[PDB]
Design a protein around this ligand. Sequence first.
Ligand SMILES: NC(=O)C1=CN([C@@H]2O[C@H](COP(=O)(O)OP(=O)(O)OC[C@H]3O[C@@H](n4cnc5c(N)ncnc54)[C@H](O)[C@@H]3O)[C@@H](O)[C@H]2O)C=CC1
Length: 285
Amino acid sequence: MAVPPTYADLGKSARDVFTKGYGFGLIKLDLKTKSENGLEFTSSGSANTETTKVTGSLETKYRWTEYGLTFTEKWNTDNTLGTEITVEDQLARGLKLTFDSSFSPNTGKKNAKIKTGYKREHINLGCDMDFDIAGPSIRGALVLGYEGWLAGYQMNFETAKSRVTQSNFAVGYKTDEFQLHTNVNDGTEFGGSIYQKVNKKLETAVNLAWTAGNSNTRFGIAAKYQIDPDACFSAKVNNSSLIGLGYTQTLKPGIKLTLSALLDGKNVNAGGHKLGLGLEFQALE
Ligand SMILES: NC(=O)C1=CN([C@@H]2O[C@H](COP(=O)(O)OP(=O)(O)OC[C@H]3O[C@@H](n4cnc5c(N)ncnc54)[C@H](O)[C@@H]3O)[C@@H](O)[C@H]2O)C=CC1
């Protein structure tokens, strides 16, 4: 109702299609369920059939009061276990406090991190600080919002030293029927994305990145085509003459099936084709 998502509108649609599902021939699974009772069940994990590579994770979240109290816990059965709590200032509207803590199984290593930021209807900025044992690091992320213009800046300051450890920048541009999302990884990595939707049922997306220092440029094109039902067919391609295809269609009333396939014409004929399966969605009534 107040202070809409600006950081998420930096390039979610672009990165969503740009991040080609890693087709390792395995099966992914993800189900999220939230209710107005403070109880939130979040399950995320993957399983490899071709090879013995299956790992599942369980995350417990809580949702109390619309925009009041939120808790996020991430515990892995095989991986590391950790939890986090988020509280929204009642009197100090806009003040958001999130405290997370990581813990290793049968290790004793405990990591504490505190995140404090403020969200304004005009702009949303937040500062996070991760406390480590070998060297604590700070992660700051500030997003600016403008009528039609969007901006986002996120970088981490190197506590162990007197300088920044990592710098990330991203620009968001919203237009009538045009959407442009740019993003650069530090002063050494710079890239951009351009999404154009056609009048008809044809969506177009573009994403490319360039590594400063060398003349190596990488670009990719991905489009989406809706058939009619709950099944949509998407296509993608890499500058390396790579043929990509992703089919997203819902199966059951709560879970969606996502298919991905990558064919590298570089040796796809004298080699093989890549396939990736993964189901993601939310469990509701
Ligand atoms: N159209 C395409 O994208 C195609 C891709 N491919 C293959 O995909 C492979 C690359 O897969 P990736 O490693 O995933 O490229 P990738 O590693 O660049 O995917 C991650 C990218 O997401 C960006 N990003 C933006 N916001 C993010 C966020 N909030 N969280 C995480 N990441 C965020 C990161 O800057 C990063 O560049 C290429 O080798 C190419 O052969 C294949 C065919 C076409």
